[PDB]
Amino acid sequence: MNPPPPETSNPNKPKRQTNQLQYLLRVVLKTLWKHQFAWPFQQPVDAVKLNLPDYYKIIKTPMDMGTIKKRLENNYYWNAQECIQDFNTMFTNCYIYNKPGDDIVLMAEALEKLFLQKINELPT
């Protein structure tokens, strides 16, 4: 069945709020979240509901935008790079599990293109 979702808080990790982290939530995450293709990426993959018996045999580092959103809201990220890495992991997992030309892969591709355009404008 499904694993616990990724951690979204770490009480032993200090917290800080920077312009880059704020931009990642209010601009990058929010724009992708509202995209027409966002829903499959808004929460952890549910292999039980979707009937994907080998998903968590193939994907050992799951990631999703619901987790990313909560991490940003909880100030889980100290470095902007941590958040960028999570988005990258989310897209890469989709490309690993699925096949070229699948609907979900085309959706990931569109979201990744938009992600790159938005992180291009990340403030200094």
Residue numbers in the entry: 43 to 166
Sentences from the paper on this structure:
Reduction of c-Myc levels has been demonstrated following treatment with degraders independently targeting both CBP/EP30026−31 and BRD4.32−42 Here, we pursued a strategy of targeting c-Myc through dual degradation of both CBP/EP300 and BRD4, via the small-molecule inhibitor ISOX-DUAL 1(43). We sought to rationalize the different affinities and ubiquitination patterns through the cocrystallization of representative degraders with BRD4 and the evaluation of the binding modes. Several high-resolution crystal structures (1.1–1.9 Å) of BRD4-degrader complexes were determined.
We proceeded to synthesize a small panel of candidate degraders based on this exit vector strategy, using 5 as a key intermediate.
